[PDB]
Structures are given as structure tokens and as C-alpha cells.
Amino acid sequence: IHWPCRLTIGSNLSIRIAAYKSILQERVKKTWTVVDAKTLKKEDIQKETVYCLNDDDETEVLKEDIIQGFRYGSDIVPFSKVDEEQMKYKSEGKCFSVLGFCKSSQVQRRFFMGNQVLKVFAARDDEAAAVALSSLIHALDDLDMVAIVRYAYDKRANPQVGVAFPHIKHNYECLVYVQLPFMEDLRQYMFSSLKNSKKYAPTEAQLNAVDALIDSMSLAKKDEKTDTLEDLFPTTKIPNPRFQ
DNA sequence: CTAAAAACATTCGTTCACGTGAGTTCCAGTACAAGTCTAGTC
Numbered sequence: 001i002h003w004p005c006r007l008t009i010g011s012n013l014s015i016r017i018a019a020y021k022s023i024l025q026e027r028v029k030k031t032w033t034v035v036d037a038k039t040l041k042k043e044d045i046q047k048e049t050v051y052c053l054n055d056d057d058e059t060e061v062l063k064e065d066i067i068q069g070f071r072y073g074s075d076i077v078p079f080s081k082v083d084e085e086q087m088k089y090k091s092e093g094k095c096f097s098v099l100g101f102c103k104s105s106q107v108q109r110r111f112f113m114g115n116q117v118l119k120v121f122a123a124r125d126d127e128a129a130a131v132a133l134s135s136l137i138h139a140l141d142d143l144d145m146v147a148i149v150r151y152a153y154d155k156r157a158n159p160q161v162g163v164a165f166p167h168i169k170h171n172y173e174c175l176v177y178v179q180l181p182f183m184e185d186l187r188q189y190m191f192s193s194l195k196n197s198k199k200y201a202p203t204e205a206q207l208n209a210v211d212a213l214i215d216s217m218s219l220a221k222k223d224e225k226t227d228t229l230e231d232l233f234p235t236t237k238i239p240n241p242r243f244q
Numbered sequence: 245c246t247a248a249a250a251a252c253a254t255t256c257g258t259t260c261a262c263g264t265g266a267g268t269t270c271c272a273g274t275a276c277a278a279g280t281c282t283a284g285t286c
Contacts, residue, residue, distance in 0.1 A: 001255065021256095049261080157257055 003153070004123070005096040007133075015132045016123035017096065022176070023117040026240065093155030096120075098164075099148045107146055107163045107180070114179030118151075120164065121174045137166040137173050151177065 002018040009015075036044045051066060053059045069078045122130035140146065146165040152158075164177040194200060202210070219233045 003256090153257060 002124075005094060007120070007136075007149075008095075008097040009136075015136070016126065016129040017120050017133065017175075018123060019096075019118045019120045019177070021116050022119040025115060026243075028243070091152065091155070091159055093152050093157060095150060095152045095159070097150045099150055099161070101140075101145045101147055104144050104146045104165060107165075111181055111186075112178045113181045113185065114160070114162075116179075118177035119167070119174050120177055121172075133175070134173060137168065137175060141166040141168055147175075148180070149177070151179070 002020060004016070004018050006014040007017045033042050034045055034047075035042050051061050051063070053061065067078055068081050068084065069076050071077075120133075122133045146163050149162055149164050151160050151162050160179050161182070162177050162179045164175045167174050167176045220229045220231055223230055
């Protein structure tokens with residue numbers, strides 16, 4: 001299916017766009033139902049959840065008598081669902097706005113977040129939006145730039161910051177969007193250097209052996225006088241064995 | 245006949261509940277060492 005929205009570069013410029021999920025992990029659509037061993041029916045087994053206090057009597061409390069709460073460092077602060085909904089962050093949903101433009105070298109693949117990749121094309125049938133999107137894509141490609149944008153599926157969806165970069169092919173062109181991390185989503189860890197360690201420094205013979213191993217295990221071959229690498233093990237085209 | 249208002253069907257995102265493997269650390273449990281064993285006279 002297509003997700004329609006309006007790419008915004010300012011306050012008076014908007015381009016109708018449609019986004020599809022180019023890449024998304026595929027799961028099993030069918031689940032497993034618990035059934036009784038003696039008789040293979042799910043209606044003979046009932047699953048229920050109960051709530052009890054911290055007393056030896058195991059006093060039972062109804063669901064309606066339960067309040068949501070959060071921990072505040074050894075102190076419990078009650079926070080009802082209605083209060084949270086009233087005070088939760090609110091934003092205008094269904095937005096695709098361009099926060100800015102930055103050099104592609106400033107965005108690194110290792111920082112990509114999320115579990116999906118979006119492909120954004122022009123609207124269904126209109127030459128104006130197609131021309132505008134093509135102009136934007138070509139400008140970004142020529143200038144070596146990407147668009148830092150704000151993405152929100154709808155009102156409920158939590159807004160996110162992502163990077164959209166051009167993707168031009170001989171038959172089609174589009175914008176590839178991938179989510180970007182927040183400041184608190186980054187983990188700052190320290191790792192000991194390996195290039196300046198006198199105990200883990202490999203010798204010349206070891207380096208030669210590793211080079212020979214790498215040469216002998218190349219999954220890409222050079223074609224005959226055409227300068228076009230050929231993949232010998234294209235794992236991207238292999239179906240997931242779990243389904244089979 | 246006609247369009248439009250209502251109802252119905254689908255996909256997605258978010259939330260929550262449960263189950264489970266892995267890493268860290270805190271503590272109950274165990275083991276072991278050392279002291280005690282009555283008070284007095286002659």
C-alpha cells in the first residue's frame with residue numbers, strides 16, 4: 001500500500017508524495033494456538049490474569065481498582081492513564097517536513113535506526129509533483145547532500161528524525177528515507193585501541209597469511225575486460241530458510 | 245436514477261503482557277578457626 005503525504009521544504013512549498021516500505025522484516029503471519037493434549041480444542045483451555053497485594057492472604061484486587069505508576073528512584077509516583085494521556089506530548093500527525101540539508105558525509109550508515117526503509121515517489125498521477133521531486137532529487141545528488149526530515153505516521157505515531165537521500169536508477173528515481181538516532185539513543189562506550197598495542201600487534205608473516213586468506217576467499221569476481229564486479233554469493237537474493 | 249450517508253474491511257503503529265537467554269552483583273548458606281568447659285583450699 002501507499003502512504004500519501006506532503007513533503008515540506010518551507011511554509012509555502014509542498015510536494016505531494018507517496019511512501020512505500022521498500023524493506024521490512026518478514027514474519028510468520030500464522031500464530032500457534034494452545035490446545036489440550038487429550039482433546040485438540042482451544043475452547044477447553046482458558047487463560048486469565050489476576051492481581052494480588054503484597055500480603056500473605058493473597059488478597060484479590062479487580063482491574064478497575066488498578067492505577068498506573070512509575071518509578072522515580074526508590075519513590076513510587078502514581079500516574080493515571082487519563083493524566084498521562086492529557087499531559088503526553090502532542091503533535092500534528094501525518095507530517096513529512098524537511099528540517100534541513102546536510103552533507104552526505106555527515107550521515108553514517110552505522111547510525112541508522114528503525115526497522116524499515118521508506119521509498120518516496122511523487123503522487124499517484126500528476127506531472128507537477130513528479131517534476132518537483134525530480135528537481136529536488138537531482139539537486140541533492142549533484143550537490144552531494146541529504147535532507148534531515150521529521151517523520152510522523154499519524155497523530156499517535158511518535159515523531160522521529162530521519163535522513164532522506166536521493167536514489168536515481170536508469171528506470172526510476174526516488175528518495176530513500178531511513179530513521180536517525182536521538183541523543184539518548186547513542187551509547188558512549190570506550191574500547192582499547194588495537195593499532196598501538198605491543199602485545200596484540202601481528203607480525204609480518206601473520207599479516208601475509210591473513211592477506212592470502214582474504215584473497216583466497218573473495219566472493220566477488222572481476223569480469224572479462226569490462227570492470228564490473230560479479231557477486232558469487234548474493235545472499236540478498238536467498239529466501240529466508242525458516243519459512244521453507 | 246443519482247449521489248451521498250452509513251457501514252464494513254484492511255493495514256499500520258503503539259501499547260502491553262509473557263516468555264526467555266545473557267551479564268552483573270548481592271546475599272544466604274556453607275566452611276573453617278578460635279575460645280570455653282566450676283570453684284576453692286592447701
